[PDB]
């Protein structure tokens, strides 16, 4: 049947689609500049925050996260990277100091302890079905004052 042709086209579009994400994904992969990646990360955190994609943490979830942080103490300046930057005067620079402070604030977050949404469907179905013109338009009247796709058109 000719329905088989329809199947091939649908696959062809899906294949052409997958390539496009691959090409774009390949190119974004190569760019690894800090400023570029920093801008993308910031914009992503806004979108997730604004859309509240992330679920609220229960009190038990926070306690477990706090427990691991106390168990490990992974976000203090005793880590290998933090100790390396501090002891060698590389944190006097502003940028590497920001990363150290970013790490430290993130650690601090985990350490913290008469009587007097349902989106409205304004479609035509939710309607006050009230019941009450051409001649009145005659009263107004008395007042006065694909073609060409394959063939020549």
């Amino acid at each position: 049947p000719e329905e088989m042709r329809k199947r091939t086209t649908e696959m062809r579009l899906m294949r052409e689609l997958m390539f496009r994400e691959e090409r774009k994904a390949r190119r974004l992969k190569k760019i690894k500049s800090k400023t570029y990646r920093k801008i993308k990360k910031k914009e992503l955190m806004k979108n997730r925050e604004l859309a509240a994609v992330s679920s609220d943490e229960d009190n038990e979830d926070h306690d477990i996260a706090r427990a691991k942080e106390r168990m490990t103490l992974k976000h203090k300046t005793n880590s290998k990277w933090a100790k390396d930057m501090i002891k060698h005067g590389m944190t006097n620079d502003a940028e590497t100091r920001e990363e150290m402070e970013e790490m430290l604030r993130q650690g601090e977050r985990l350490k913290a302890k008469n009587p007097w949404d349902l989106l409205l469907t304004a479609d035509d179905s939710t309607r006050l079905k009230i019941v009450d013109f051409k001649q009145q338009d005659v009263i107004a009247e008395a007042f006065a004052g694909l073609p060409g796709w394959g063939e020549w058109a």
């Binding site: 649908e10 579009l13 899906m14 689609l17 993308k40 992503l44 979108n47 997730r48 604004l50 859309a51 509240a52 994609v53 992330s54 008469n114 009587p115 007097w116 949404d117 349902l118 989106l119 409205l120 469907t121 304004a122 939710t126 309607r127 006050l128 079905k129 009230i130 019941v131 009450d132």
Partner: protein, 341 residues
């Protein structure tokens, strides 16, 4: 006037009357208030919308502080109980509260609550005429029993905000610090009455402060005690004595409902699909997809602003992607899972 009617859906883009436009003309009210009554059919909210519409149509039955203390605030405390962010529900509280007042004590109630006697009586009269026209034209004798209504549910109160926003889609104002934090620096010491807002579709000036609009002294928000809502509905703008524009608030509206209502109006546009962790354009087929978009609200000579991203279902129609329906966070997550399985 044509533009306002078009935003309400009264007129189409070619300035002919729509079916809604004909439908509103049957009522004795302004086009804004009709639209409130038009959408009220859901979940028996009609009695509340009629009361709100009658109150606004007739004028405020409240006596202001300037025109006149503990007694005044005491009466105000009683009628603001329905919602802490709505002037409209303060009006609804009084009008429906009167219904349970027996006729003999009505005069004592109006004086006891600093309420203008004449206006409420016309509000009563105009409520009957509205309920009469709707019952007569929907299928008629209306008694005072018919106006007696119980408290709205929490679900209803959110809906009333949406119906109210339907008629005042063009009078939404956003806190200025959200758009221009540099120019509108809000501190915890700042009085609520001095927090700047920016109306939608406001004509941009070289100095943005010229467009600022502040809360009216009479609004309950001045006594709110916390930061005001992100977006606000206002009825009209008044020039205060200090050359400061003051806005008569109606009620607060959240971002996602606001996009929902403006979707049917000309006041919403959709950005390109978002990309990143969580936000991924799920492709069912070459013609339909699920994705997150950033709705832009407002009409580039005016003040429009972007709303929170909302998951949408898009379909490719004649080469262009058209948003069919909105999707909850759970609905999108399950969708992302389904294609993985």
């Amino acid at each position: 006037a044509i533009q306002l009617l078009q935003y309400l859906g009264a007129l189409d883009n070619k300035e002919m009357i729509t079916e809604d436009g004909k439908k509103m003309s049957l009522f004795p009210l302004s086009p804004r208030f009709s639209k409130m009554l038009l959408v009220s059919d859901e979940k028996a909210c009609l009695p509340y919308i009629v009361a709100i519409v009658s109150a606004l149509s007739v004028g405020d039955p409240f006596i202001n502080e300037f025109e006149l203390r503990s007694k005044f605030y005491k009466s105000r405390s009683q009628f603001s109980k329905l919602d802490k962010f709505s002037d409209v529900f303060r009006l609804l509280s009084v009008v429906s509260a009167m219904d349970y007042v027996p006729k003999e004590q009505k005069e004592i109630f109006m004086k006891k609550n600093f309420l203008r006697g004449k206006l409420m009586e016309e509000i009563v009269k105009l409520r009957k005429q509205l309920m009469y026209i709707i019952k007569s034209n929907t299928s008629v004798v209306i008694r005072n029993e018919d106006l007696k209504s119980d408290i709205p549910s929490v679900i209803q109160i959110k809906l009333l905000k949406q119906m109210i926003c339907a008629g005042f889609v063009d009078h939404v104002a956003v806190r200025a610090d959200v758009l221009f934090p540099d120019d509108a620096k809000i501190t915890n010491r700042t009085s609520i009455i001095n927090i700047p807002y920016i109306p939608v579709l406001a004509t941009r000036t070289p100095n943005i402060e010229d467009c600022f609009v502040y809360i009216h002294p009479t609004s309950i928000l001045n006594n709110l005690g916390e930061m005001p809502p992100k977006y606000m509905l206002y009825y009209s703008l008044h020039l205060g004595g200090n050359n400061k524009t003051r806005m008569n608030t109606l009620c607060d509206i959240a971002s996602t409902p606001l996009a929902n209502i403006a979707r049917k109006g000309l006041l919403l546009t959709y950005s390109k699909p978002l990309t990143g962790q969580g936000l991924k354009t799920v492709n069912l087929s070459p013609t339909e997809r699920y994705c997150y978009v950033v709705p832009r609200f407002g009409s580039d000579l005016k003040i429009g602003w972007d709303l929170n991203p909302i998951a949408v279902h898009q379909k490719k129609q004649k080469g262009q992607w058209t948003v069919i329906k909105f999707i909850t966070r759970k609905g999108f997550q399950t969708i992302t899972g389904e294609e993985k399985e």
